[PDB]
Amino acid sequence: ELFTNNALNLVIIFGSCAALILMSFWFRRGNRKRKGFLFHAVQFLIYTIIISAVGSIINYVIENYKLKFITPGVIDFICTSLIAV
Amino acid sequence: ELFTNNALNLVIIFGSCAALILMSFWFRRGNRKRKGFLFHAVQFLIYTIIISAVGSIINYVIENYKLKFITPGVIDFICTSLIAV
């Protein structure tokens, strides 16, 4: 659905939009338009936040529609692999 | 069956085809037709991916047809032995 899916998503779905806003701010770089070290650190941090939110997003999808065969072990393994990469 | 088995296989069965495509690409070697060190490393990695996918493939076979007497402990022991070899 659309309204029911949005209601069940709670703030997990809005995490992607918030992270997009944060990425736009980092493109503006906030206080000063610079990059190096800490900039990459905070970018990696909010990417990890993106993946953490996506974990709950996909956890709700197979819980509110159908369990199917996702076996969330594999998706958390994939998320850890992406974080490592 | 054929259609039901394919539907229940999900992307685990297609992992073998994807790995075959990756092996063909490694035969083409992608950027440059060379080998050594990292080439063997990535080949071992995608072989491990093959075995990991086959684990779930065989896990679904005895779950959707009949449990029988496989005792998945022995098959994971065999897969670990093959990885070590």
Q: Note whether A53 and A16 are within 8 A (CB).
A: yes
Distances (CA, A) of A79 to A5, A19, A50, A62: 23, 17, 10, 17
Contacts of B72 (CB under 8 A, 6+ apart): B58, B59
Does A78 contact chain B (CB < 8 Å)?
no
The CA-CA-CA angle for residues B56, B66, B71, to 5°, reads 60
Q: Note whether A20 and A28 are within 8 A (CB).
A: no
CB spacing of B60 vs A71 below 8 angstroms:
no
Residue A68's closest chain B neighbor by CA? Answer: B8
Experimental technique used to determine this entry: cryo-EM
* Chain B residues closer than 8 Å to A74 by CB: 56
CA distance, residue A18 to nearest chain B CA (Å): 31
The CA-CA-CA angle for residues A18, A60, A69, to 5°, reads 130
* Chain A residues closer than 8 Å to B60 by CB: 69
Does B8 contact chain A (CB < 8 Å)?
yes
Which residue is associated with the tokens 């098959």? B75
Determine the Cα–Cα distance for residues A66 and A45; give it in Å rounded to an integer.
32
